[PDB]
Ligand binder design. Sequence first.
Ligand SMILES: COc1ccc(C(SC[C@H](N)C(=O)O)(c2ccccc2)c2ccccc2)cc1
Ligand SMILES: Nc1ncnc2c1ncn2[C@@H]1O[C@H](COP(=O)(O)OP(=O)(O)O)[C@@H](O)[C@H]1O
Ligand SMILES: [Mg+2]
Ligand code: NA
Length: 331
Amino acid sequence: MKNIQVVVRCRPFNLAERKASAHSIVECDPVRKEVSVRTSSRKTYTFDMVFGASTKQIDVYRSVVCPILDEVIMGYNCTIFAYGQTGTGKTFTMEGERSPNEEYTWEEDPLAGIIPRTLHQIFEKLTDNGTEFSVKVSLLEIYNEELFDLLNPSSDVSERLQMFDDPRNKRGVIIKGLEEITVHNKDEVYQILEKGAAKRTTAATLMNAYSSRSHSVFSVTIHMKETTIDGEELVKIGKLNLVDLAGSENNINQSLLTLGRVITALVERTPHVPYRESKLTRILQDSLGGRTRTSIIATISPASLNLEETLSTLEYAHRAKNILNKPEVNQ
Ligand SMILES: COc1ccc(C(SC[C@H](N)C(=O)O)(c2ccccc2)c2ccccc2)cc1
Ligand SMILES: Nc1ncnc2c1ncn2[C@@H]1O[C@H](COP(=O)(O)OP(=O)(O)O)[C@@H](O)[C@H]1O
Ligand SMILES: [Mg+2]
Ligand code: NA
């Protein structure tokens, strides 16, 4: 029925990265939707949208997320995930950072990313849309095939969760004891994201290379009740997953390895797709050849130092455009 959207976002050169040449190794064409990489010998790859080095946070949100957020409110499950080498901007893009000195409020911090922006807009868009709705969110991170709850307000972070097949959902799982915090309004948001960021920091003291190796699944489930002209009970449920994947360069890497075998299985149209053999592919089975509306943001470097992963990343992301999903709304 419908193709997975792939986008590419390149970041500006960082402090480590030397640029020798007068003209770029990575050129992004937003109009032609082409990323062109100098291996005058090139490989040019077309994507669904492309975002060069100076693309700001608000544009990414505007171009990619605003459209998807509308599908969430109709009650499609969506899933945006970020993919690419450590240091290209998967966390910058999906979470963002906090500007120093309290120069800006969270709502207006231009370093803010998809997660906080989205949560903010869910409340603006639904408050003046007439709907009866609630928002409850959760923050699960996978590391070494273990499940960490960063929003559980009480528990020690190293208390890890179990997963089991949802007896109500053919291609889904329930994460037992996962803290699903109800957000009653936008002013409850920051406090929740802070607690998430803090617990995360604690988990990093416990495990090696945690930032780069962890997958981070930040869900948000919109319950929307609506009365019909016929006097019925229209209860629709949007779910948006916002997934920050472990760095592409990596049992520690079982989930990332399996994500590859799944995508491979799907594109080459081989009958057995091994969702079941990793926690990530179990949690997101429905985002990959299922009934969810997936977008991948593939984050690349502009620089010669990281060309090899920049290109690995582009080939991996580009074959992912051939996956067909059959979106369905939850009532
Ligand atoms: C789980 O999703 C999150 C968590 C934390 C943040 C975030 S950015 C966190 C940063 N991505 C990180 O991993 O440390 C925040 C930072 C510090 C305190 C509280 C929040 C932020 C929120 C709104 C605006 C700007 C920055 C953003 C998204
Ligand atoms: N699009 C961007 N604009 C400005 N700075 C960026 C951008 N993407 C990444 N950076 C910076 O480069 C570093 C890498 O970001 P990070 O989100 O940790 O990457 P990842 O999560 O992909 O390992 C951070 O310091 C970040 O602020
Ligand atoms: Mg990161
Ligand atoms: Na264990």
